[PDB]
Symmetry: C3
Subunit: 432 residues, 3 copies
């Protein structure tokens, strides 16, 4: 059940009812391809040239508040595992564990247990079916089918400098991926979540070309660990709130995704980086701040004493809309034409200057100036929370503008400083 509340007082809206699936860690697996080290004859010859060129190719290869975020190194974990694979005997240990089976767990020298997977055995095909020789066109066609995956994996690594994301189905098919997922050291809830959202897993994964040695091509596939699942998440949408006379504006800068997480709240300022499937919200904690849960008080009382709500101030009263989960915030200023239109695309509401809102219940589109917006048609209940625009409480003569990284308290203190000087001068001039 998605619900939404629009706060007329602060030109913002919160969409609730979502459930988290946060990427909190990384699981590293090792994917191997076993290789053979070596008219119809002419066709099979150039197909073998493609095989040989691909192998040497990989060998040559082997040789508003976003600014507050930290800086990670997203493939540090997989690169660390890849460095381990270059150590003496480490590849032979994997090649021995996969002689009899195609999937096995190996303990690496650095104290990390990895799943290994042999997804293609070109050694078996070339040595036992091709090295004897053609007579049959079926054999050249068959070789083209077995070789094609290696050729495409090589093409992908070649234009991506050895590191791909999302992980393609050439890197890992869906059968292989679902198989990997079922044996990961993770909870049953995690396996079910990953299996039902395999395309999101692919988008959050990396494939890291690693080593080609002892007739084994190995790459690391770095898959997300979802260590936070099924906690409540909510999306905060914000738009500029201006006077409508010489006008002053403020905007809540804390727009983004929020998810309850381990007694705090994970805040993702770039909402567009999260992926939303139905009511499940996939975000990456690398893109988050960890905030006190009192940050949510900014939605019910922006002047609350427990948390200093973030805002920016300006005098740039331009018109726009923010399309929410269940409706549309409209910031309409100056001479702009701002309307909402219904299922027959007849205008049913004309917005006055100010910040206002409509739900997707009877509205299909909103137009602000020359920009038409389609609203999301997701089912849910929207509530309009009436309130006097807080911009009305500010004296424009002492209003601090061009504040980007500001807050309620910061702005109040500047106002207090400005008023103190005026009161001091009026009394110092009257005494003189």
């Amino acid at each position: 059940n998605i619900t939404e509340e629009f706060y007329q007082s602060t030109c913002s809206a919160v969409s609730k009812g979502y459930l988290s699936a946060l990427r909190t860690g990384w699981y590293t697996s090792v994917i191997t391809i076993e290789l053979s080290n070596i008219a119809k004859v002419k066709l099979i010859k150039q197909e073998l040239d493609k095989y040989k060129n691909a192998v040497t190719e990989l060998q040559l290869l082997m040789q508003f508040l976003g600014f507050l975020l930290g800086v990670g190194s997203a493939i540090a974990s997989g690169v660390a595992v890849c460095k381990v694979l270059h150590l003496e005997g480490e590849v032979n240990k994997i090649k021995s564990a996969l002689l009899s089976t195609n999937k096995a767990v190996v303990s690496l020298s650095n104290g990390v247990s990895v799943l290994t997977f042999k997804v293609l055995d070109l050694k078996n095909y070339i040595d036992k079916q091709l090295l004897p020789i053609i007579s049959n066109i079926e054999t050249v066609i068959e070789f083209q089918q077995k070789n094609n995956r290696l050729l495409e994996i090589t093409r992908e690594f070649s234009v991506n400098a050895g590191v791909t994301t999302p992980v393609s189905t050439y890197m890992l098919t869906n059968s292989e991926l679902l198989s990997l997922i079922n044996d990961m050291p993770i909870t049953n809830d995690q396996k079910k979540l990953m299996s039902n959202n395999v395309q999101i897993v692919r988008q959050q994964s990396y494939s890291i070309m690693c080593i080609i040695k002892e007739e084994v091509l190995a790459y690391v596939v770095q898959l997300p660990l979802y260590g936070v699942i099924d906690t409540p998440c909510w999306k905060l949408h914000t738009s500029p709130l201006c006077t409508t006379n010489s006008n002053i504006c403020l905007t809540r800068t804390d727009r983004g995704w929020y998810c309850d997480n381990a007694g705090s709240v994970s805040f993702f300022p770039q909402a567009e980086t999260c992926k939303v499937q139905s009511n499940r919200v996939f975000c990456d904690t690398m893109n988050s701040l960890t905030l006190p849960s009192e940050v949510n008080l900014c939605n019910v009382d922006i002047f609350n004493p427990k948390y200093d709500c973030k805002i920016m101030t300006s005098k740039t009263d331009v018109s726009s809309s923010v399309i929410t989960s269940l409706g549309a915030i409209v910031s309409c200023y100056g001479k702009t034409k701002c309307t909402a239109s219904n299922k027959n695309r007849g205008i049913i509401k004309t917005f006055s200057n100010g910040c206002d809102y409509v739900s997707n219940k009877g509205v299909d589109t909103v137009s602000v100036g020359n920009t038409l917006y389609y609203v999301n048609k997701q089912e849910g209940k929207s509530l309009y929370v009436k309130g006097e625009p807080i911009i009305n409480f500010y004296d424009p003569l002492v209003f601090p503008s061009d504040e980007f990284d500001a807050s309620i308290s910061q702005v109040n203190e500047k106002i207090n400083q400005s008023l103190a000087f005026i009161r001091k001068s009026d009394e110092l001039l009257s005494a003189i």
Copy 2:
């Protein structure tokens, strides 16, 4: 005829002579693939496994001033149509309309008329040519050709979580796209514009994986509607204007594309998002503000009383160049070596400190510091508009710096406030 004017007074240039093609709306079409629900034998078997895996795969899938812009939901319209397709009988209505023909218009339950297109009939091939059985290698090769498009469409949807852009030729071939365009509910000028710029259409379109049901795979292709065409557009290029003594700077922040539109001007602050083909400018109104046409006065008189021109101020006098449509603005400060070189790449001009400009008439490259820039070699006429740099009119002792979201009037008022305090203190101290 492209022309350009450089304004020495404000370190900016306007390139004119372009014609608009603005994406203002969305047209939703439904693309269907009819499916069969079920040595040479071994080759045909695994090709059928690919077909079957692809089908279940899709079923698993089905289960400076940019900060002033609003926030849209770009696939709201297509997703809305896709939700309609999941309603009872809605797929059977499309499957019946396409039994006899491959393209037909269907009226959807939500009151929207859509073009539907059957681009591949795998049902017909598998049921009537493959289900009887091999003898012929031509039949296994033929099946590989018919199956390949489904396999590639599936691969594309798999790494893009069911939503692709640009729309590939696997999603829609050029014949199919040109066919679709010719029957859209659009003017003949729109059809001609789309047909002659099919690669831009592809880049502005979305493919949305929708439903697989009743032996029909359906995706929505969301194509741009160009509701503004052939109006004048112009590109504004801006660069920092600093004193050249302790130095102060300002930069016009309103750089971007401007197009006349419906009595106002659509302003696109991120010029790099628009696509330019010859003199035709493809921008998306989702990425625009709607401004009074008096915004253009900032190019002829930045102090004009009708529109408050936007600027940022600073003390960071670093050197750079802005390559324009027909030349190069050069902001050369401090000790930087700044030059322009001719067709033989001999230096023909050395820039002095300040903001200056050369046209592409005799210049192939400009170098600022260690950065070499190639200038665009588009034919056109450039005009150098002489004028005293406006930064010379500001007293640095009362110049407000670190103003990002500022304007001519805002800066003037801060200057006035600063001067008022100085005049008051000088008179209050003299009386004491």
Copy 3:
């Protein structure tokens, strides 16, 4: 030998020991494909339809401190060469030079010498092997192999509007690319660098669809020229430094890559755009400022008199980490849990409020709040440079905040201005 120093006084770290490979220019080559202008029969027929559709398809196609950077036109050089190819006889001059050989140097009319390369001769295959006619399935399979490259090149150009980057192996194979590199007008050190980093070359190159005329399809491949190689580079990492009481913060804004270059320093503020292979740093001077070499003094003495070090100020004391080349800077404020954990992922250090640092020697991960970071496991020597946090030297009562584009001197002058007013008022009030 990579080394790193952490400056406790300024919450920053410098990673040293890297060597430059800067893209400073562009080399333009012309790549041509010679074309034929014209059950097994049914298979060969539709393969010829693909060939014909691809040809007409291309003919239709032919018809913190980043804000301080300038604006280039990255394909101006290649587009300039392409315009030359449309001039009368210019294509015939290339077609004659490639009749006997597949690679030749041609002097263009604009005074530029280009390497030309015939990578595929479909004219020879269609006219001499296909036009006589099928009997043999080998001939239809052979045609599918020769045609496939043209079909894929066309697909790539179609979804990229005629301009691709990185340059794929369909555009230029690795043999072709390595061949091109060996004959470029460049030093032997450049050839070796390009040949050993072909995947980086591909990522910095453009393919520009140019002309299809006189049975010749031609595209320009624009390859990087690395005119600065083997000079020292260093990476500056910075994180917010706040008091830990009402708190004030500053952050060094000059984070990014720095490379010695021609007596100055090339500064790349968006470090993520550079590519790092082992200790070689590939950056693009289009993404750089050219700075005095005294900018490096900010790392040893941020108050130095020779260069005015850049900082931003604020009151937003939120916690985060910056993962460096050899360790991790941790900015831990408020109630945040901040820890570092060892090879067995046991916590071995808990950070106090403030800015601190660990090396990758005994640490595998750092956690700040709900965000776990893996550190890079690159071998190297880290040095912790102790020093009193410079934020401790500022009186918070006169500290200017919300300064984004600021510097040490700018902040000092604002402080001086604020203190002057307070001292003047205290003396003017005491006299009254």
